Write a protein that binds this ligand. Structure first.
Ligand SMILES: Nc1nc2c(ncn2[C@@H]2O[C@H](COP(=O)(O)OP(=O)(O)NP(=O)(O)O)[C@@H](O)[C@H]2O)c(=O)[nH]1
Ligand code: MET
Ligand SMILES: [Mg+2]
Lengths: 80, 129, 409
RNA sequence: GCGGGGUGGAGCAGCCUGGUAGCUCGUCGGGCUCAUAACCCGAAGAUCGUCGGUUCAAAUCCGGCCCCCGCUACCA
């Protein structure tokens, strides 16, 4: 395997700052379903924006931890 | 029961990964003769016809082997070039790719020959010729 | 055709496939290009001929080609049998296939690595799977001794000789090898020529077999005039198939009617029979075969009928949706780096039920002492009453072997 | 051996049609609002991979290597 990822804060609307998740292989990973799952973890709005997922608010640690729970390599994930 | 095993461990260890006799060469008119072409080949587990065929082909000269395992090349060639072409023979048909042992066999099948290491155990496929 | 099915269990990258390569020559390709950067991903396959130097000394007397003049001298070694292997993977997650694979084995060889901490996760996971399913004819092998201190490989032999104690493993011998330089393999052939004996199989029995691969032979571009048939790869266990018999595949393909689900049996004629690269007219247990069929190769491209079984057409076999398992648990989860103690089964839990070659998922409707009733996504054709099964749970994202039992009808 | 690509911190434009380096992630200043966002304007930052060639002028055109990526789709 070899799937890296970046998780960082991204400007958004009301609240403070959104959360951006990128780096998934879109041919293997369905971002729509991933986003739906992540939205339940964070209990916030979100969308698939191009090849990324954008979540409202700061949920960097939450998302990273959930991704590990889902079988993605701990070492492939970077929070910025 | 260790004896059986300890034994086994012994026998494998003794199978792991012999300079090469200097190939004596001379001249007599217009012939180059390898006094020990037989012994030489003998100690690299290779058939004389084979080293002969190869070595000859490269030389582009005729020749056969003594009734006393000697190579008579119908052409007077320089001791040196013989080696140069000989090592090349070793490289391509005797030396293992995996570890370079020179301690090998030479299989043959319909049209695929293989070098078979007695040390590492690997098979370098070679161009049957 | 090969007599018997020997499995090569063990942890990852200890070199299982490599040992198979020193014994047969064959590689498992490592394919899909992915396997080529990774490692064995499908069960690898390979066969070989074992003859013996009567006319000389053992273990070396244990030959591989009709040729004795390798040790002692010439007298064309006498042929004892032709065997087959099943290279599993080693990765903690390919557990579900290796399980599957065992269903075909008649015995095994545990490749431990000489230069890494003895009971490594998967090594154990496997071992206990072996003692659980029934594969009692075992040979442990100490692999990478070509990279260790002459002390190290003996002390490991100790930890091994000590693990192999309370457990069922009396004199499961331990033959240290060097899969890289093919050293000591002949004493391995002597082990496997002693301990992994070739089981009798009554032929008269119902023709029954497990499937673990299937391919579309057809090259990119072969014209329709010579589209070669669909091809089913797997192993026979009881009975014997012959060229031109009428056959069926179970549970077989499911239909779609607006969200409904419905599997049903596929019939065809054995177009052909092949072991290794050589064609035969019949086929009997031990080995993997491949069966040429007359069915649309679409139907068995990538490995579709994986976990399906083939039997006599017009034969009596149940295609269950719900099943009665009798059962037992391990006290630990030998397969996580962590040994956390097995929680008893709660109902409405999803568990992987590994039955035969198949790998199915199912939910728990009943929870008694050692009899639970399971509801399945994909049907299981239960060929016997003796149906061994293996039961797993998604512990931490990755699934894990936790306990077993017997199918019940 | 072919052919694609090295541009502010990251990820992409601009190059065959030579002189104007554009876009998105947060910063800073000023607006809008009763206020926060959003939106708006104004600001920081680039030897454009390197060693040179042609030109008035080279991110741009022609050659020299240095790492980066792919090549006509895989076997009872
Ligand atoms: N030094 C040494 N290296 C070995 C030995 N056996 C295997 N290796 C190395 O170990 C690597 C792993 O080989 P491989 O067979 O793919 O391991 P595997 O266990 O079969 N992979 P998988 O678990 O998925 O089947 C190879 O690169 C090989 O070079 C050995 O005895 N000595
Ligand atoms: C990979 S399936 C193993 C045996 C089969 N006959 C081959 O070909
Ligand atoms: Mg492998």
């Amino acid at each position: 395997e070899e799937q890296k990822i970046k998780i960082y804060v991204t400007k958004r609307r009301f609240g403070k700052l959104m959360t951006i998740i990128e780096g998934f292989d879109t041919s293997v990973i369905d971002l729509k379903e991933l986003a739906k799952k992540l939205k339940d973890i964070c209990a916030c709005g979100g969308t698939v924006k191009d090849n990324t997922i954008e979540l409202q608010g700061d949920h960097r640690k939450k998302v990273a931890e959930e991704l590990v729970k889902m079988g993605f390599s701990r070492d492939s994930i970077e929070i910025r | 029961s260790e004896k059986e095993y300890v034994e086994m461990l012994d026998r494998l260890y003794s199978k792991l990964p012999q300079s090469l006799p200097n190939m004596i060469i001379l001249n007599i008119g217009n012939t180059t003769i390898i006094r020990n072409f037989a012994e030489y080949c003998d100690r690299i587990r290779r058939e004389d016809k084979i080293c002969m065929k190869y070595l000859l082909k490269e030389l582009a000269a005729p020749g056969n082997v003594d009734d006393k395992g000697e190579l008579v090349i119908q052409g007077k060639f320089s001791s040196q070039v013989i080696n140069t072409l000989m090592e090349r023979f070793l490289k391509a048909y005797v030396e293992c790719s995996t570890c370079k042992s020179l301690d090998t066999i030479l299989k043959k099948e319909k049209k695929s020959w293989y070098i078979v290491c007695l040390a590492c155990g690997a098979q370098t496929p070679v161009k049957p010729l | 055709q090969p007599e018997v099915n020997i499995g090569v269990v063990g942890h990852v990258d200890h070199g299982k496939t490599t040992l198979v390569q020193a014994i047969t020559g064959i590689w498992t390709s490592k394919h899909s290009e992915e396997l080529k950067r990774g490692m064995t991903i499908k069960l690898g396959y390979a066969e070989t001929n074992i003859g013996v130097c009567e006319s000389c000394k053992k273990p070396e007397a244990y030959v591989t080609e009709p040729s004795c003049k390798s040790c002692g001298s010439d007298d064309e070694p006498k042929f004892l049998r032709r065997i087959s292997f099943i290279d599993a993977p080693g990765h903690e997650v390919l557990m579900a296939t290796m399980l599957s694979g065992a269903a075909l084995m008649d015995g095994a060889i545990l490749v431990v690595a000489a230069n890494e901490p003895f009971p490594q996760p998967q090594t154990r996971e496997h071992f206990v799977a072996l003692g659980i399913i029934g594969v009692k004819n075992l040979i442990i092998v100490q692999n990478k001794v070509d990279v260790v201190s002459k002390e190290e490989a003996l002390s490991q032999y100790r930890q091994i000789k000590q693990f192999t104690k309370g457990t069922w493993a009396e004199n499961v011998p331990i033959i240290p090898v060097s899969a890289l330089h093919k050293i000591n393999i002949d004493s391995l052939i002597e082990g496997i020529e002693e301990y992994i004996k070739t089981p009798y199989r009554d032929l008269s029995q119902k023709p029954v077999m497990l499937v673990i691969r299937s391919f579309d032979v057809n090259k990119p571009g072969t014209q329709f005039n010579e589209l070669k048939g669909g091809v089913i790869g797997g192993s026979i266990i009881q009975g014997l198939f012959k060229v031109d018999q009428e056959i069926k595949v179970l549970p077989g393909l499911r239909v779609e009617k607006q969200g409904k689900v419905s599997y049903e049996p596929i019939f065809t004629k054995i177009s052909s029979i092949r072991f290794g690269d050589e064609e035969f007219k019949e086929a009997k247990p031990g080995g993997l075969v491949a069966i040429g069929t007359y069915l649309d190769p679409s139907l068995t491209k990538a490995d579709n009928l994986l976990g399906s079984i083939i039997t006599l057409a017009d034969a009596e076999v149940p295609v269950l949706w719900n099943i009665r398992i009798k059962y037992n648990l391990l006290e630990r989860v030998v397969g996580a780096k962590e040994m956390l103690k097995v929680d008893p089964i709660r109902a409405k839990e999803t568990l992987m039920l590994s039955v035969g070659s198949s790998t199915t998922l199912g939910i728990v409707t009943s929870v008694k002492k050692d009899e639970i009733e399971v509801e399945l996504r994909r049907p299981v054709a239960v060929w016997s009453n003796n149906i061994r099964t293996v039961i797993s749970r998604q512990i931490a994202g990755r699934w894990r072997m936790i306990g077993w039992g017997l199918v019940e009808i």
